Amino acid sequence: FTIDDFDIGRPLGKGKFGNVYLAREKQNKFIMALKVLFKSQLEKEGVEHQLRREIEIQSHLRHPNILRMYNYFHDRKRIYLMLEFAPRGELYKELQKHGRFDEQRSATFMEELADALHYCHERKVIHRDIKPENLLMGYKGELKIADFGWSVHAPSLRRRTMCGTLDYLPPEMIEGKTHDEKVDLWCAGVLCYEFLVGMPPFDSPSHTETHRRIVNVDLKFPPFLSDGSKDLISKLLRYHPPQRLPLKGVMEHPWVKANSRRVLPPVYQ
Amino acid sequence: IPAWASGNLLTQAIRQQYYKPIDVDRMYGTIDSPKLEELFNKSKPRYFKR
Numbered sequence: 187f188t189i190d191d192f193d194i195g196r197p198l199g200k201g202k203f204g205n206v207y208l209a210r211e212k213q214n215k216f217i218m219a220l221k222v223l224f225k226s227q228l229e230k231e232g233v234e235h236q237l238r239r240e241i242e243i244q245s246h247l248r249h250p251n252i253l254r255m256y257n258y259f260h261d262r263k264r265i266y267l268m269l270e271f272a273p274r275g276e277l278y279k280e281l282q283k284h285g286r287f288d289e290q291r292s293a294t295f296m297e298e299l300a301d302a303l304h305y306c307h308e309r310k311v312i313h314r315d316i317k318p319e320n321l322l323m324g325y326k327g328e329l330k331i332a333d334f335g336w337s338v339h340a341p342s343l344r345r346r347t348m349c350g351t352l353d354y355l356p357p358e359m360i361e362g363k364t365h366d367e368k369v370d371l372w373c374a375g376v377l378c379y380e381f382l383v384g385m386p387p388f389d390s391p392s393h394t395e396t397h398r399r400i401v402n403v404d405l406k407f408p409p410f411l412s413d414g415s416k417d418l419i420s421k422l423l424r425y426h427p428p429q430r431l432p433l434k435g436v437m438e439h440p441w442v443k444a445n446s447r448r449v450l451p452p453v454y455q
Numbered sequence: 456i457p458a459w460a461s462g463n464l465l466t467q468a469i470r471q472q473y474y475k476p477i478d479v480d481r482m483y484g485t486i487d488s489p490k491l492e493e494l495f496n497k498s499k500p501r502y503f504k505r
Protein backbone atom coordinates (compact mmCIF):
# COMPACT_ATOMS: atom_id res chain seq x y z
CA PHE A 187 0.00 0.00 0.00
CA THR A 188 0.83 3.73 -0.43
CA ILE A 189 -0.75 6.97 0.63
CA ASP A 190 -2.12 7.45 -2.84
CA ASP A 191 -4.34 4.32 -2.39
CA PHE A 192 -6.56 6.42 -0.07
CA ASP A 193 -8.81 9.43 -0.21
CA ILE A 194 -8.19 11.38 2.95
CA GLY A 195 -11.36 12.58 4.52
CA ARG A 196 -10.68 14.60 7.65
CA PRO A 197 -8.60 14.45 10.89
CA LEU A 198 -10.08 12.22 13.67
CA GLY A 199 -7.52 13.20 16.23
CA LYS A 200 -3.96 14.25 17.03
CA GLY A 201 -1.71 11.58 18.31
CA LYS A 202 1.71 12.13 19.86
CA PHE A 203 3.51 11.28 16.63
CA GLY A 204 1.05 12.47 14.00
CA ASN A 205 -2.54 12.58 13.20
CA VAL A 206 -5.22 9.99 12.67
CA TYR A 207 -7.34 10.49 9.61
CA LEU A 208 -10.63 9.23 8.39
CA ALA A 209 -9.76 7.68 5.09
CA ARG A 210 -11.31 5.66 2.31
CA GLU A 211 -9.30 3.02 0.47
CA LYS A 212 -9.87 3.90 -3.21
CA GLN A 213 -10.22 0.52 -4.85
CA ASN A 214 -12.90 -0.97 -2.46
CA LYS A 215 -14.28 2.40 -1.16
CA PHE A 216 -13.68 0.95 2.33
CA ILE A 217 -13.66 3.44 5.20
CA MET A 218 -10.89 3.05 7.76
CA ALA A 219 -8.68 5.21 10.01
CA LEU A 220 -5.11 5.93 8.94
CA LYS A 221 -2.72 6.64 11.78
CA VAL A 222 0.31 8.64 10.66
CA LEU A 223 3.53 8.51 12.56
CA PHE A 224 6.67 10.64 11.76
CA LYS A 225 9.78 8.55 11.64
CA SER A 226 12.16 11.33 12.88
CA GLN A 227 9.98 12.04 15.92
CA LEU A 228 9.79 8.33 16.73
CA GLU A 229 13.57 8.01 16.51
CA LYS A 230 14.20 11.18 18.54
CA GLU A 231 12.00 9.88 21.33
CA GLY A 232 13.66 6.45 21.14
CA VAL A 233 10.37 4.56 20.70
CA GLU A 234 11.23 2.38 17.71
CA HIS A 235 11.37 -0.90 19.59
CA GLN A 236 8.22 -0.11 21.56
CA LEU A 237 6.38 0.69 18.35
CA ARG A 238 7.55 -2.47 16.67
CA ARG A 239 6.34 -4.57 19.59
CA GLU A 240 2.90 -2.80 19.64
CA ILE A 241 2.42 -3.37 15.93
CA GLU A 242 3.61 -7.00 16.18
CA ILE A 243 0.95 -7.61 18.86
CA GLN A 244 -2.01 -5.68 17.42
CA SER A 245 -1.52 -6.76 13.83
CA HIS A 246 -1.90 -10.47 14.72
CA LEU A 247 -5.11 -10.13 16.77
CA ARG A 248 -8.49 -10.76 15.16
CA HIS A 249 -11.48 -10.31 17.45
CA PRO A 250 -14.72 -8.23 17.17
CA ASN A 251 -13.83 -6.35 20.35
CA ILE A 252 -10.20 -5.61 19.50
CA LEU A 253 -9.55 -2.75 17.10
CA ARG A 254 -8.21 -4.41 13.89
CA MET A 255 -5.00 -3.33 12.19
CA TYR A 256 -5.55 -4.30 8.65
CA ASN A 257 -1.98 -3.64 7.37
CA TYR A 258 0.69 -0.91 7.48
CA PHE A 259 3.20 0.78 5.15
CA HIS A 260 5.78 3.51 5.13
CA ASP A 261 7.15 6.26 2.97
CA ARG A 262 10.20 8.50 3.19
CA LYS A 263 9.04 10.35 6.33
CA ARG A 264 6.00 8.52 7.76
CA ILE A 265 4.78 5.16 9.02
CA TYR A 266 1.10 4.58 8.33
CA LEU A 267 -1.14 2.15 10.28
CA MET A 268 -4.34 1.01 8.59
CA LEU A 269 -6.87 0.64 11.45
CA GLU A 270 -10.49 -0.23 11.80
CA PHE A 271 -12.58 2.92 12.06
CA ALA A 272 -14.56 3.17 15.35
CA PRO A 273 -17.51 5.31 14.37
CA ARG A 274 -18.74 6.05 17.87
CA GLY A 275 -15.28 7.22 18.95
CA GLU A 276 -13.68 7.32 22.41
CA LEU A 277 -15.31 5.46 25.28
CA TYR A 278 -13.91 7.92 27.79
CA LYS A 279 -15.83 10.77 26.12
CA GLU A 280 -19.08 8.89 26.46
CA LEU A 281 -18.47 8.10 30.13
CA GLN A 282 -17.57 11.78 30.80
CA LYS A 283 -20.68 12.97 28.96
CA HIS A 284 -23.01 10.62 30.92
CA GLY A 285 -21.11 10.69 34.22
CA ARG A 286 -21.82 6.96 34.72
CA PHE A 287 -23.18 4.12 32.66
CA ASP A 288 -26.24 2.12 33.55
CA GLU A 289 -26.10 -1.54 34.32
CA GLN A 290 -27.03 -2.66 30.82
CA ARG A 291 -24.34 -0.63 29.13
CA SER A 292 -21.76 -1.62 31.77
CA ALA A 293 -22.53 -5.34 31.67
CA THR A 294 -22.41 -5.30 27.88
CA PHE A 295 -18.98 -3.66 27.90
CA MET A 296 -17.82 -6.16 30.50
CA GLU A 297 -18.82 -9.14 28.48
CA GLU A 298 -17.06 -7.74 25.37
CA LEU A 299 -13.97 -6.86 27.35
CA ALA A 300 -13.71 -10.26 28.98
CA ASP A 301 -14.14 -11.98 25.61
CA ALA A 302 -11.38 -9.84 24.01
CA LEU A 303 -9.10 -10.33 26.99
CA HIS A 304 -9.71 -14.10 26.98
CA TYR A 305 -8.72 -14.11 23.27
CA CYS A 306 -5.55 -12.27 24.28
CA HIS A 307 -4.72 -14.54 27.18
CA GLU A 308 -5.26 -17.72 25.07
CA ARG A 309 -2.28 -16.31 23.04
CA LYS A 310 -0.30 -15.34 26.15
CA VAL A 311 -0.74 -11.64 25.45
CA ILE A 312 -1.22 -9.49 28.56
CA HIS A 313 -2.78 -6.11 27.92
CA ARG A 314 -1.67 -4.28 31.08
CA ASP A 315 -3.49 -1.02 30.58
CA ILE A 316 -7.17 -1.51 30.50
CA LYS A 317 -8.97 1.76 31.25
CA PRO A 318 -11.68 3.72 29.48
CA GLU A 319 -9.25 5.95 27.55
CA ASN A 320 -7.83 2.83 25.79
CA LEU A 321 -11.24 1.77 24.44
CA LEU A 322 -13.12 2.88 21.30
CA MET A 323 -16.67 2.14 20.22
CA GLY A 324 -18.10 0.47 17.14
CA TYR A 325 -21.16 1.31 15.04
CA LYS A 326 -23.50 -0.42 17.48
CA GLY A 327 -21.45 0.83 20.47
CA GLU A 328 -19.36 -2.34 20.69
CA LEU A 329 -16.25 -2.05 22.81
CA LYS A 330 -12.99 -2.06 20.93
CA ILE A 331 -9.64 -2.41 22.70
CA ALA A 332 -7.63 0.12 20.84
CA ASP A 333 -4.29 0.90 22.65
CA PHE A 334 -1.72 -1.94 23.09
CA GLY A 335 1.05 0.36 24.33
CA TRP A 336 1.83 -1.57 27.49
CA SER A 337 0.95 -5.05 26.12
CA VAL A 338 3.42 -7.93 26.16
CA HIS A 339 3.63 -11.44 24.82
CA ALA A 340 4.68 -13.41 27.91
CA PRO A 341 4.77 -17.08 27.08
CA SER A 342 6.84 -18.31 30.03
CA LEU A 343 8.28 -15.81 32.43
CA ARG A 344 6.61 -13.64 34.99
CA ARG A 345 7.00 -9.89 34.46
CA ARG A 346 8.46 -7.06 36.60
CA THR A 347 7.58 -3.81 34.78
CA MET A 348 5.51 -1.21 36.56
CA CYS A 349 3.07 -0.28 34.00
CA GLY A 350 -0.44 0.99 33.42
CA THR A 351 -2.18 3.90 34.96
CA LEU A 352 -2.21 4.95 38.67
CA ASP A 353 -5.86 4.29 39.51
CA TYR A 354 -5.74 0.95 37.75
CA LEU A 355 -2.48 -0.47 39.19
CA PRO A 356 -2.80 -3.88 40.78
CA PRO A 357 -1.37 -4.41 44.28
CA GLU A 358 1.40 -6.67 42.96
CA MET A 359 2.81 -3.94 40.74
CA ILE A 360 2.81 -1.43 43.59
CA GLU A 361 4.54 -3.93 45.88
CA GLY A 362 7.31 -4.71 43.35
CA LYS A 363 6.28 -8.35 42.98
CA THR A 364 6.43 -10.23 39.69
CA HIS A 365 3.13 -10.19 37.76
CA ASP A 366 1.33 -12.33 35.18
CA GLU A 367 -1.87 -12.16 33.15
CA LYS A 368 -4.00 -11.79 36.20
CA VAL A 369 -3.18 -8.05 36.21
CA ASP A 370 -5.83 -7.77 33.50
CA LEU A 371 -8.47 -9.36 35.86
CA TRP A 372 -7.79 -6.68 38.40
CA CYS A 373 -7.97 -3.88 35.87
CA ALA A 374 -11.29 -5.30 34.56
CA GLY A 375 -12.68 -4.89 38.06
CA VAL A 376 -11.52 -1.31 38.39
CA LEU A 377 -13.08 -0.63 34.98
CA CYS A 378 -16.45 -2.16 35.90
CA TYR A 379 -16.53 0.06 39.08
CA GLU A 380 -15.63 3.20 37.10
CA PHE A 381 -18.27 2.43 34.46
CA LEU A 382 -21.00 2.20 37.12
CA VAL A 383 -19.79 4.90 39.50
CA GLY A 384 -17.97 7.33 37.16
CA MET A 385 -14.86 7.49 39.41
CA PRO A 386 -12.23 4.75 40.00
CA PRO A 387 -12.56 2.91 43.36
CA PHE A 388 -9.24 4.12 44.98
CA ASP A 389 -9.38 7.79 43.95
CA SER A 390 -7.26 9.87 46.32
CA PRO A 391 -5.64 13.25 46.69
CA SER A 392 -2.05 11.78 46.35
CA HIS A 393 -0.24 8.95 44.64
CA THR A 394 0.83 7.48 48.01
CA GLU A 395 -2.69 7.48 49.38
CA THR A 396 -4.03 5.85 46.19
CA HIS A 397 -1.28 3.15 46.48
CA ARG A 398 -2.29 2.57 50.12
CA ARG A 399 -5.94 2.17 49.22
CA ILE A 400 -5.05 -0.30 46.44
CA VAL A 401 -2.77 -2.55 48.46
CA ASN A 402 -5.32 -2.64 51.26
CA VAL A 403 -8.16 -3.18 48.75
CA ASP A 404 -10.03 -0.33 50.41
CA LEU A 405 -13.17 -0.75 48.34
CA LYS A 406 -16.17 1.36 49.45
CA PHE A 407 -19.26 0.65 47.34
CA PRO A 408 -21.75 3.47 46.81
CA PRO A 409 -25.18 2.51 48.00
CA PHE A 410 -26.76 2.85 44.51
CA LEU A 411 -24.91 -0.23 43.10
CA SER A 412 -26.79 -3.46 42.66
CA ASP A 413 -25.84 -6.54 44.61
CA GLY A 414 -24.92 -8.29 41.34
CA SER A 415 -22.57 -5.56 40.17
CA LYS A 416 -20.87 -5.47 43.64
CA ASP A 417 -20.55 -9.23 43.49
CA LEU A 418 -18.66 -9.13 40.19
CA ILE A 419 -16.44 -6.24 41.15
CA SER A 420 -15.60 -7.88 44.49
CA LYS A 421 -14.64 -11.08 42.80
CA LEU A 422 -12.27 -9.33 40.39
CA LEU A 423 -10.65 -6.91 42.93
CA ARG A 424 -8.91 -9.65 44.97
CA TYR A 425 -5.59 -8.92 46.56
CA HIS A 426 -4.25 -12.36 45.67
CA PRO A 427 -3.98 -12.79 41.85
CA PRO A 428 -4.90 -16.49 41.85
CA GLN A 429 -8.14 -15.75 43.63
CA ARG A 430 -9.49 -13.34 41.04
CA LEU A 431 -12.48 -14.41 38.96
CA PRO A 432 -11.34 -15.77 35.64
CA LEU A 433 -12.36 -14.08 32.44
CA LYS A 434 -14.66 -16.98 31.53
CA GLY A 435 -16.14 -16.38 34.98
CA VAL A 436 -16.82 -12.76 34.15
CA MET A 437 -18.64 -13.86 30.89
CA GLU A 438 -20.69 -16.44 32.91
CA HIS A 439 -21.41 -14.17 35.85
CA PRO A 440 -25.16 -13.89 36.51
CA TRP A 441 -25.12 -10.08 36.53
CA VAL A 442 -23.44 -10.11 33.12
CA LYS A 443 -25.91 -12.66 31.82
CA ALA A 444 -28.92 -10.72 33.12
CA ASN A 445 -27.88 -7.31 31.93
CA SER A 446 -25.63 -7.64 28.85
CA ARG A 447 -27.15 -6.91 25.40
CA ARG A 448 -23.98 -7.84 23.53
CA VAL A 449 -24.37 -8.25 19.75
CA LEU A 450 -21.65 -9.71 17.52
CA PRO A 451 -21.02 -7.62 14.41
CA PRO A 452 -21.82 -9.16 11.02
CA VAL A 453 -18.88 -10.96 9.47
CA TYR A 454 -17.98 -11.77 5.87
CA GLN A 455 -19.85 -13.69 4.35
CA ILE B 456 -13.91 18.12 3.77
CA PRO B 457 -14.96 16.00 0.86
CA ALA B 458 -18.63 15.14 0.85
CA TRP B 459 -18.22 11.35 1.48
CA ALA B 460 -16.66 12.21 4.83
CA SER B 461 -19.33 14.30 6.55
CA GLY B 462 -22.75 14.06 8.16
CA ASN B 463 -25.10 12.00 6.05
CA LEU B 464 -23.16 10.44 3.20
CA LEU B 465 -20.74 9.27 5.92
CA THR B 466 -23.47 7.96 8.27
CA GLN B 467 -24.99 6.14 5.40
CA ALA B 468 -21.71 4.60 4.21
CA ILE B 469 -20.77 3.41 7.72
CA ARG B 470 -24.15 1.63 8.10
CA GLN B 471 -23.70 0.14 4.73
CA GLN B 472 -20.27 -1.15 5.66
CA TYR B 473 -21.41 -2.62 9.05
CA TYR B 474 -24.05 -4.75 7.30
CA LYS B 475 -21.99 -5.64 4.24
CA PRO B 476 -18.58 -6.53 5.69
CA ILE B 477 -15.80 -7.07 3.24
CA ASP B 478 -13.42 -10.00 3.33
CA VAL B 479 -10.72 -8.00 5.08
CA ASP B 480 -8.54 -11.05 5.77
CA ARG B 481 -8.17 -11.57 2.02
CA MET B 482 -8.42 -7.95 0.86
CA TYR B 483 -5.86 -6.57 3.34
CA GLY B 484 -4.37 -9.64 5.12
CA THR B 485 -2.97 -11.23 1.97
CA ILE B 486 -1.34 -7.99 0.85
CA ASP B 487 2.34 -7.66 1.49
CA SER B 488 3.66 -5.48 4.26
CA PRO B 489 7.10 -3.99 5.03
CA LYS B 490 9.16 -6.05 7.43
CA LEU B 491 8.99 -4.57 10.89
CA GLU B 492 12.79 -4.32 11.01
CA GLU B 493 12.63 -2.17 7.86
CA LEU B 494 10.11 0.39 8.99
CA PHE B 495 12.74 2.93 9.99
CA ASN B 496 14.97 2.20 7.02
CA LYS B 497 14.89 3.26 3.44
CA SER B 498 11.59 3.79 1.68
CA LYS B 499 11.99 2.55 -1.87
CA PRO B 500 9.57 3.92 -4.41
CA ARG B 501 6.83 1.64 -5.93
CA TYR B 502 8.01 2.07 -9.53
CA PHE B 503 11.45 1.70 -10.99
CA LYS B 504 11.85 0.50 -14.56
CA ARG B 505 13.62 1.83 -17.68
Ligand SMILES: Nc1ncnc2c1ncn2[C@@H]1O[C@H](COP(=O)(O)OP(=O)(O)NP(=O)(O)O)[C@@H](O)[C@H]1O
Nearest residue numbers: 198199200201202206219269270271272273275276
Ligand atom coordinates in the same frame (compact mmCIF):
# COMPACT_ATOMS: atom_id res chain seq x y z
N1 LIG C 1 -9.50 3.87 14.77
C1 LIG C 1 -10.01 4.99 15.14
N2 LIG C 1 -11.30 5.26 14.84
C2 LIG C 1 -11.83 6.50 15.21
N3 LIG C 1 -11.04 7.47 15.87
C3 LIG C 1 -9.77 7.10 16.12
C4 LIG C 1 -9.26 5.90 15.76
N4 LIG C 1 -7.99 5.85 16.17
C5 LIG C 1 -7.75 7.04 16.74
N5 LIG C 1 -8.84 7.82 16.73
C6 LIG C 1 -9.05 9.19 17.22
O1 LIG C 1 -7.70 9.76 17.05
C7 LIG C 1 -7.30 10.24 18.41
C8 LIG C 1 -5.79 10.13 18.72
O2 LIG C 1 -5.44 8.82 18.34
P1 LIG C 1 -4.65 7.74 19.28
O3 LIG C 1 -4.25 6.49 18.49
O4 LIG C 1 -5.46 7.50 20.49
O5 LIG C 1 -3.59 8.70 19.88
P2 LIG C 1 -3.92 9.29 21.42
O6 LIG C 1 -5.20 8.82 21.99
O7 LIG C 1 -3.67 10.77 21.42
N6 LIG C 1 -2.73 8.49 22.13
P3 LIG C 1 -1.20 8.46 21.25
O8 LIG C 1 -1.45 8.24 19.79
O9 LIG C 1 -0.75 7.30 22.06
O10 LIG C 1 -0.85 9.83 21.69
C9 LIG C 1 -8.10 9.31 19.36
O11 LIG C 1 -8.27 9.88 20.62
C10 LIG C 1 -9.45 9.20 18.73
O12 LIG C 1 -10.25 10.25 19.15
